Design goal:
Chain B: Keywords: Copper, Metal-binding, Zinc. Two copies of one chain form a homodimer. With about 280 residues, chain A is an all-alpha fold. The first copy, chain A, has helices at about 15-30, 30-45, 60-80, 90-95, 160-165, 185-190, 200-210, 225-240, 275, and strands spanning about 5, 280. In chain A, helix 3 (about 60-80) packs across helix 8. Bound molecules: copper (II) ion (CU) (4 copies) and zinc ion (9 copies).
């Protein structure tokens, strides 16, 4: 319970400072990249081979897989600075502002601005400007800087609304067969964003564009973790009123007690975020 | 000390059949695939980025990485069957054979036959012939079945010889700066086979050909594990021979490479697997 993830808009200037600062040590030491590669590899790992499913997406493992990813990440954050926790970007309310692109979250004193078209959309403001922050594609080779493109598509021109979220929290079943994209009536698939997609989680990705728009190169952007803290919390919160599928008869690595490549972690090991050691602002 | 690792030519027919069975069981569950990916994963993980080194190859972590790779595999074989251990293929001895392809390892009751040129090289014999054994390519997707290409390359027509192993075993440094393909007088890069290459470890990867000849898909071939047990066995022997020489780099090497660094995709460090006895096994020698 006793470790609290706040709303970014609740953070003090010293917190945003410690966060942004602590994240650079991790990039520096070489531990942040481990997180990029785990996530990339999880996405190549299809369950089973020949399937749309992969270990970390497009199935029930989506939520636990990412829960453990953050938990593992936040612990590393702690080792550097014990006073730091993982914040959440509450995109669903940024979505109401006349111009979400203006949300404090994008301040040069935290993550940084939208991409600079004049530089083919390389972000050139904030701590993760190209030059200060290296990035790497899918082949696992340097790529030359973070690129953002706030609502540049037509598929995802806007962030998800409070009603998109509220309407997901209403789903009875954590997940249903066939435990994939085409999963009807399943809190998992809905939050993820495939029902009339992209929505919710998926939509946030496409909206930011840049690396974030591609699963193979999403963690290259720290927003990735703020986005997923909010996803995690949506679930966390779901978990109080409805408080997993499948248990068995899912593909291997989708069941309650299966291992989640690239780890030996199981859905069950992280079903109670408090037993993990952290809570949200609520 | 208790898991004894046996030469492939010392194996009984039930031993040959216990292993094969178990590997297939691991494959049936979905555990085998996890290993293939772990390896492809590590190879795309450069230390640092922009470098030719990855977490598993081309640098000092190549040796301890695979030790941890096989240790995990063996423990998985063992849970299926308390009796199975990881056999080693002593390829330095098959190299003396008039036609290495005749060796009992490639028997149809163990690993199976070389690729068959009538079918663009797909192995149609043994327990892992295409149809009884499914493969991925380098992007994660089904590929079409195991494929073997015995010494068909100009660069790697021969298996490495015992003389070749004896030269590695000669080196006094575990590795040297800069801890990559270019490290001179380094056991690691010698055994790996980059010194006037391909040699030793690489040579054998190339000689087999097919999946086994490419980093990202090598472990699609169960012989990958037979081959690295030998590599490990040779390293373990170098460790007794040079008892007062330890791993390098001890410190102030690329993160991912130092004595005490974690090894992607794992949290295990070289320092965890430096002595095979504690890990729980021995080679019959
Ligand atoms: Cu995501
Ligand atoms: Cu993702
Ligand atoms: Cu190898
Ligand atoms: Cu390899
Ligand atoms: Zn909300
Ligand atoms: Zn809660
Ligand atoms: Zn864990
Ligand atoms: Zn023996
Ligand atoms: Zn016999
Ligand atoms: Zn590469
Ligand atoms: Zn271990
Ligand atoms: Zn061909
Ligand atoms: Zn020994």
């Amino acid at each position: 319970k006793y470790r609290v993830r706040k709303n970014v808009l609740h953070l003090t200037d010293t917190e945003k400072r410690d966060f942004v600062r602590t994240v650079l040590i991790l990039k520096e030491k070489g531990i942040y990249d481990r997180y990029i590669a785990w996530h990339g590899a999880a996405g190549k790992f299809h369950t089973p081979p020949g399937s749309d499913r992969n270990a970390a997406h497009m199935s029930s493992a989506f939520l636990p897989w990412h829960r453990e990813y953050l938990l593992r990440f936040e612990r590393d954050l702690q080792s550097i600075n014990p006073e730091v926790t993982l914040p959440y970007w509450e995109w669903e309310t940024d979505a109401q502002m006349q111009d979400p692109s203006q949300s404090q979250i994008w301040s040069a004193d935290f993550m940084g601005g939208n991409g600079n078209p004049i530089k083919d959309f390389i972000v050139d403001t904030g701590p993760f400007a190209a030059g200060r922050w290296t990035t790497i594609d899918e082949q696992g080779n340097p790529s030359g800087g973070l690129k953002r493109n706030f609502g540049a598509t037509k598929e995802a021109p806007t962030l998800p609304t409070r009603d998109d979220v509220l309407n997901a929290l209403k789903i009875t079943q954590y997940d249903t067969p066939p435990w994939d994209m085409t999963s009807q009536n399943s809190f998992r698939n809905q939050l993820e964003g495939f029902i009339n997609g992209p929505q919710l989680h998926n939509r946030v990705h496409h909206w930011v564009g840049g690396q974030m728009g591609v699963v193979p190169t999403a963690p290259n952007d720290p927003v990735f973790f703020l986005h997923h803290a909010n996803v995690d919390r949506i679930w966390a919160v779901w978990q109080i009123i409805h408080r997993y599928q499948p248990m068995k008869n899912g593909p291997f690595g989708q069941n309650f007690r299966d291992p989640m490549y690239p780890w030996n972690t199981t859905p069950e090991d992280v079903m109670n975020h408090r037993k993990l050691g952290y809570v949200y602002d609520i």
